[PDB]
Amino acid sequence: LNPSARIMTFYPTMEEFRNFSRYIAYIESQGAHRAGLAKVVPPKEWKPRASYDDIDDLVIPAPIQQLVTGQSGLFTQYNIQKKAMTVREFRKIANSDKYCTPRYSEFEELERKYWKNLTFNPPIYGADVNGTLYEKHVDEWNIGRLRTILDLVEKESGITIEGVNTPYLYFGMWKTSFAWHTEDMDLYSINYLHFGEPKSWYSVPPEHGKRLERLAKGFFPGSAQSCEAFLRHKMTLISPLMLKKYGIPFDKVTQEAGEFMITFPYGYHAGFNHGFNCAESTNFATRRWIEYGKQAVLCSCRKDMVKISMDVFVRKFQPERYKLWKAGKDNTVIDHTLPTPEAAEFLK
Numbered sequence: 001l002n003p004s005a006r007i008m009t010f011y012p013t014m015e016e017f018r019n020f021s022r023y024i025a026y027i028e029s030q031g032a033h034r035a036g037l038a039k040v041v042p043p044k045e046w047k048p049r050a051s052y053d054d055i056d057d058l059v060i061p062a063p064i065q066q067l068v069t070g071q072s073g074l075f076t077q078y079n080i081q082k083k084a085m086t087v088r089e090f091r092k093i094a095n096s097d098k099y100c101t102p103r104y105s106e107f108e109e110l111e112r113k114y115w116k117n118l119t120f121n122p123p124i125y126g127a128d129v130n131g132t133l134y135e136k137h138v139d140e141w142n143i144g145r146l147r148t149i150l151d152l153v154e155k156e157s158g159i160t161i162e163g164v165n166t167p168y169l170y171f172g173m174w175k176t177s178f179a180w181h182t183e184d185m186d187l188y189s190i191n192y193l194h195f196g197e198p199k200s201w202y203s204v205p206p207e208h209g210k211r212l213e214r215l216a217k218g219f220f221p222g223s224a225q226s227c228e229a230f231l232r233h234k235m236t237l238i239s240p241l242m243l244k245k246y247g248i249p250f251d252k253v254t255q256e257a258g259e260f261m262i263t264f265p266y267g268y269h270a271g272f273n274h275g276f277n278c279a280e281s282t283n284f285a286t287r288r289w290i291e292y293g294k295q296a297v298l299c300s301c302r303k304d305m306v307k308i309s310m311d312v313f314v315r316k317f318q319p320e321r322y323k324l325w326k327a328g329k330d331n332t333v334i335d336h337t338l339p340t341p342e343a344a345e346f347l348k
């Protein structure tokens with residue numbers, strides 16, 4: 001399904017929305033994973049929070065100033081940690097005439113201004129803030145407790161990895177970016193825009209992921225030479241015009257307040273925020289993910305880089321391959337077009 005591998009949008013009914021793992025299995029049966037990214041608009045009647053009016057006190061312990069250097073569509077982003085600040089302090093900086101959204105008529109225009117001005121007037125991103133904005137009673141798509149098999153890490157080793165099996169919050173402002181990357185251990189990820197201006201996304205089909213990597217390696221040989229997974233440093237920006245010029249397939253989509261974005265295993269993506277907004281996200285998994293976990297190329301140059309032990313997963317979900325895998329002889333080749341097993345029932 002989905003032979004063009006374009007980003008799909010879904011509209012679950014409340015009945016469909018209730019079972020998260022089941023709906024993820026559903027959209028995959030429709031080919032949604034092929035684009036590496038998919039949007040899910042929740043039923044009009046759902047809401048994770050009554051109001052977002054008491055958080056002006058929330059502290060953003062580590063805001064980041066995003067300095068970007070580059071030319072001709074190729075850039076490197078340097079984060080500079082600023083002193084803690086609360087939301088109030090952030091919104092005002094964000095809406096001030098110095099950092100606010102430019103005037104525009106269409107998205108094509110804002111996109112152009114982004115790529116033309118990303119190296120100028122470095123903005124601040126209140127990123128990676130531990131926490132959730134969900135009310136403790138919301139049981140549908142609660143990013144704080146999705147109950148997928150990824151819980152097996154916490155559940156067998158008590159190991160929690162901030163932002164991975166725990167929720168993160170991001171407060172952005174015009175021009176703040178997320179560099180090209182796949183998730184840690186090439187996991188899935190879910191992102192919910194709580195409020196504010198839109199966030200635009202770019203994505204490359206998992207099946208064409210290696211092509212993006214060769215492109216990046218070609219443009220940054222030094223970086224490539226010292227880390228086998230330098231894109232995991234989340235510092236590399238490449239414009240759609242460069243992607244188009246070198247033949248890399250990609251699609252773009254704009255997520256609005258109240259919408260979810262799901263990224264799939266080995267799906268490269270990047271993007272930027274339109275203005276002041278707040279988003280929440282975490283990582284999750286399905287059975288199809290295990291093979292990806294086992295074959296993910298990891299960052300070989302830093303410390304505290306996320307490394308999940310695939311052992312408990314192979315043991316429990318692939319008992320017949322455990323011995324071969326342990327011996328380093330498991331040579332399964334991943335087929336990026338195959339939906340996850342849990343999708344069987346929608347393919348009857």
Ligand SMILES: CN(C)NC(=O)CCC(=O)O
Binds near residue numbers: 170199263
């Ligand atoms: C988890 N991942 C899909 N989320 C993103 O890449 C967006 C992060 C951001 O909003 O800066």
Ligand SMILES: CN(C)NC(=O)CCC(=O)O
Binds near residue numbers: 016022023026346
């Ligand atoms: C129930 N939900 C998970 N799935 C759907 O509504 C789609 C069912 C189908 O495959 O037509």
Ligand SMILES: [Cl-]
Binds near residue numbers: 219220221224
């Ligand atoms: Cl280089």
Ligand code: NI
Binds near residue numbers: 182189
């Ligand atoms: Ni991501």
Ligand SMILES: [Zn+2]
Binds near residue numbers: 226227301
């Ligand atoms: Zn590295």
